[PDB]
Amino acid sequence: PTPVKPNYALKFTLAGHTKAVSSVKFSPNGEWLASSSADKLIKIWGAYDGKFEKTISGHKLGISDVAWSSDSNLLVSASDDKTLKIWDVSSGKCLKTLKGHSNYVFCCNFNPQSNLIVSGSFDESVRIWDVKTGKCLKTLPAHSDPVSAVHFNRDGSLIVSSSYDGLCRIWDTASGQCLKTLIDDDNPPVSFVKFSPNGKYILAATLDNTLKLWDYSKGKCLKTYTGHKNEKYCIFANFSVTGGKWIVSGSEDNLVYIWNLQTKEIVQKLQGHTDVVISTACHPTENIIASAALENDKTIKLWKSDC
Amino acid sequence: XXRAX
């Protein structure tokens, strides 16, 4: 066990999209790969062979983010049209249109129970929705700048959000109250955040070309990850725990970066993308990485490793 | 997309 470094190789390229891809997410059941784009479209691909499945349309503008329900039955999207849509993956049909945000919707996620949805927007608020009714349960004045990321913890009792205002906040799901604010004296814009698979920590990407692992419980910075380039775009970062433990993230030098979780040293740099890697995701069960890039690339790539 | 620029 405890591999020293992985060996990710390019297996497939998924070209369908006609405009820059914004994000890619593996389904919880591991069967599918969903992708959002500026072309107003969502697309389903086979997670293993990259075979194109279907196109899901309905939004009136570009979509910045997409997320799966726990049973892999539903999808939620965040669009520039100020709304979110819940989709039935099987029929590609719009079940609910979540209206209430006053500006672009930047990010979105289900809770593990998948009865709620969290969303961030350029209107600087975090909103909590009821999946069944499509109602907006709570609106949080989360930040003083656009919200770049939103994520539930393991039991969905907490929400983590990040913003350009350089702040990062944990919220109590049930009350909407802010429980913790993570401050940095240099406070670079926080471009992304998410809880660790175990829920003890949060991984925060910040626009000073740095990724940081925080113990939000005791407000301690455990790890730093650099070497990559990120000064402009809100780029997804992941924990990879199917094989060896690593950190995965896109970059503005058109590369996919992989650090050793503990040593913080770069173990591999995936080459092939002809534009900024805006989104990366790791397969729930297998050693598989998915990556997407912007206007000059517009494609998704599937990488596989042994470690 | 706002995320793609």
| Contacts with A, B 1-5, CB within 8 Å | 2-5
Q: State the Cα angle at A232 between A267 and A154, rounded to 5°.
A: 60
Residue showing tokens 């069967």: A31
Top-level CATH class of A1-307? mainly beta
Distance of alpha carbon A226 from alpha carbon A20, whole angstroms? 25
Strands A190-195 and A178-182: unpaired
Q: What one-letter code names the amino acid at A208? A: D
Question: Residue A74's CB: how many other CB atoms inside 10 A?
Answer: 20
Q: How far apart are the first and last CA of chain A?
A: 9
Q: With an 8 Å Cβ cutoff, are A20 and B2 in contact?
A: no
**Domain ranges (residues) in chain A:** 1-307
Instruction: Give the E-state strand segments of A42-177 in sequence order.
Output: 42-46, 52-56, 63-68, 74-79, 84-88, 93-98, 105-110, 116-121, 126-130, 136-140, 147-152, 158-163, 168-172
Q: With an 8 Å Cβ cutoff, are B2 and A37 in contact?
A: no
| Interface contact A22, partner B, CB < 8 A | yes
Q: What are phi and psi of B2, to 5 degrees?
A: -55, -45
Interface A-B: count of C-beta contacts within 8 A:
30
CA distance, residue A61 to nearest chain B CA (Å): 7
Residues of A in contact with B3 (CB under 8 A): 22-23, 64-65, 106, 233-234, 278
CA distance, residue B5 to nearest chain A CA (Å): 8
Q: With an 8 Å Cβ cutoff, are B4 and A38 in contact?
A: yes
| Interface contact A140, partner B, CB < 8 A | no
Distance of alpha carbon A138 from alpha carbon A174, whole angstroms? 9
**Structural contact between residues A90 and A96, judged by C-beta atoms closer than 8 angstroms:** no
Closest CA to A97 of A73, A120, A117: A117
Enclosing H/E stretch for A193: strand A190-195
Question: Residue A90's CB: how many other CB atoms inside 10 A?
Answer: 9
Q: With an 8 Å Cβ cutoff, are A64 and B5 in contact?
A: no
Question: Residue A5's CB: how many other CB atoms inside 10 A?
Answer: 14
What Cα–Cα distance (Å) separates residue A117 from each residue in A13, A144, A151, A263, A269? 31, 22, 9, 35, 34
Experimental method, per PDB record:
X-ray
Q: State the Cα angle at A145 between A102 and A167, rounded to 5°.
A: 135
Mutate to test the interface with B, among A22, A101, A124 (most CBs of B within 10 A): A22
DSSP A229-293: --SSS---EEEE-SSS-EEEE--TTS-EEEEETTT--EEEEE---SS-EEEEEE-SSSSEEEEEE
